[PDB]
Design a protein around this ligand. Structure first.
Ligand SMILES: *[C@@H]1O[C@H](CO)[C@@H](O)[C@H](O)[C@H]1NC(C)=O
Ligand SMILES: *[C@@H]1O[C@H](CO)[C@@H](O)[C@H](O)[C@H]1NC(C)=O
Ligand SMILES: *[C@@H]1O[C@H](CO)[C@@H](O)[C@H](O)[C@H]1NC(C)=O
Ligand SMILES: *[C@@H]1O[C@H](CO)[C@@H](O)[C@H](O)[C@H]1NC(C)=O
Length: 435
């Protein structure tokens, strides 16, 4: 079901509508030009920003889901129609960890990275950091597994030493971590994302609630339980077989049009929680943006937000000449980063009441941008057609045209021009409002 090149393509009319719970699927050519390396170009630097792979629910969510399934199985005097499987369903999910499928997604991502950047990877041991979350680190290890598998299979590889994860960035409310959020006091207190999501849930869940209660006499559900039962479609699918070869029976409880609404609920959550919808959303991504500028221009980090000054100004934990960088992070931080970089500056504020498709929103959705195993590639290339280095961003294989600079027909900008456009991040955005 899942491939190195294209990601997850089983039951795609459903599985591509799980927002951040969708397994990565390739968006090559979707509202985009070709992601191929252009004629007479040579990649000179690549930054990878990867999410962890498919996982179990977080321990608090897994507890909530188990409680819901237990309650339904206790209270229902019948399990009717499509809900009949709830009779005998055994909740077996764990918490937090990668599933076998999610491990394999990251092995595949490592292969894919080696394959796409072979000419550089042949001679490069990437410099790798991971935010300090078990599933994120494990994702890094699996990515490395795949990268080495591909490299050791390539007769043209010259520098074959395995990369280690050099930096495990601690996760806490006091540690400045560009790959996770936590230090921006006001933002961490923000409730806008949850409020927007509850509001939109109140619009669409009631009809579903009615139908489910009709099939589960004895059962009372909340709007939240409806969302819980929809979350279970993805979590169960990615856990129930090692290869996610079998769609969860939770999935066909809901119609296609309902999955569109769910996918949108997820997009709203991310947009209003971490993206431009939140007044302090993009500010959470300034830290990494400034790290990326530093890497693209081989220059010391200029940042006063969520970088750690001792991590960044020491060559051991922040080299400026590594040529390949790979960072492992979380959906929420990756959303803030992509917005801080201006990559979704063509996207207007999401309707809080009405579904808008990823294409209506110019390529933005949770499933297009931060699926399980999401990856972004930020390239620098040297082309016979141009004296200046050219920068290109690819998000889950979609060429995302840059903003803030004069972009060419291939969605690229000249390096200095791109950096010039990032004036908001370079000046620390509205970070001061954190306090
Ligand atoms: C920065 O990192 C160093 C080394 O890991 C640590 O001692 C210090 O507490 C960090 N400061 C912040 C605020 O992240
Ligand atoms: C939720 O909807 C109510 C009623 O229409 C509205 O007053 C409120 O502002 C909405 N919440 C958000 C955060 O959009
Ligand atoms: C941690 O971040 C805050 C910026 O929000 C800053 O005041 C402090 O200097 C930082 N400390 C380190 C070690 O970078
Ligand atoms: C994206 O839009 C915001 C709001 O207009 C602006 O402040 C920011 O500089 C833009 N970013 C880029 C890279 O153009």
């Amino acid at each position: 079901c899942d491939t190195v090149d294209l990601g997850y393509q089983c039951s795609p009319a459903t599985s591509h509508l799980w927002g951040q719970y969708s397994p990565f699927f390739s968006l090559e050519d979707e509202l985009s030009v070709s992601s191929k390396l252009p004629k007479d170009c040579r990649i000179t630097l690549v930054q990878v920003l990867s999410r962890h792979g498919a996982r179990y629910p977080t321990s608090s969510k897994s507890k909530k889901y188990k409680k819901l399934v237990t309650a339904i199985q206790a209270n229902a005097t019948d399990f009717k129609g499509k809900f009949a499987f709830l009779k005998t369903y055994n909740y077996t999910l764990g918490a937090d960890d990668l599933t076998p499928f999610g491990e394999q997604q990251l092995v595949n991502s490592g292969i894919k990275f080696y394959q796409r950047y072979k000419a550089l990877a042949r001679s490069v041991v990437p410099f790798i950091r991971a935010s300090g979350s078990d599933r994120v680190i494990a994702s890094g290890e699996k990515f490395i597994e795949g990268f080495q598998q591909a490299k050791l299979a390539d007769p043209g590889a010259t520098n074959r030493a395995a990369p280690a994860i050099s930096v495990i960035i601690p996760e806490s409310e006091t540690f400045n971590n560009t790959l996770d959020h936590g230090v921006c006091t006001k933002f961490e207190a923000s409730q806008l994302g949850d409020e927007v999501a509850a509001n939109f849930t109140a619009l669409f869940a009631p009809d579903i609630r009615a139908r489910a209660e009709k099939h589960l006499p004895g059962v009372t559900l909340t709007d939240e339980d409806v969302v819980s039962l929809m979350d279970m479609c993805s979590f169960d699918t990615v856990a129930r077989t090692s290869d996610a070869s079998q769609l969860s029976p939770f999935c066909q409880l809901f119609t296609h049009n309902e999955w569109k609404k769910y996918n949108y609920l997820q997009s709203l959550g991310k947009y209003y929680g971490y993206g431009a919808g939140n007044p302090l959303g993009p500010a959470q991504g300034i830290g990494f943006t400034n790290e990326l500028i530093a890497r693209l221009t081989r220059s010391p980090v200029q940042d006063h937000t969520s970088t750690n000054s001792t991590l960044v100004s020491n060559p051991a934990t922040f080299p400026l000449n590594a040529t390949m960088y790979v960072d492992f992070s979380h959906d929420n931080s990756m959303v803030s980063i992509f917005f801080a970089l201006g990559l979704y500056n063509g996207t207007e504020p999401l309707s809080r009441t009405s579904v808008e498709s990823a294409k209506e929103l110019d390529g933005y959705s949770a499933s297009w941008v931060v699926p399980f195993g999401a990856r972004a590639y930020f390239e620098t290339m040297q082309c016979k057609s141009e004296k200046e280095p050219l920068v290109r961003a690819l998000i889950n294989d979609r060429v995302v045209p840059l903003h803030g600079c004069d972009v060419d027909k291939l969605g690229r900008c000249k390096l200095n021009d791109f950096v010039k456009g990032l004036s908001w991040a370079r000046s620390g955005g509205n970070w001061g409002e954190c306090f």
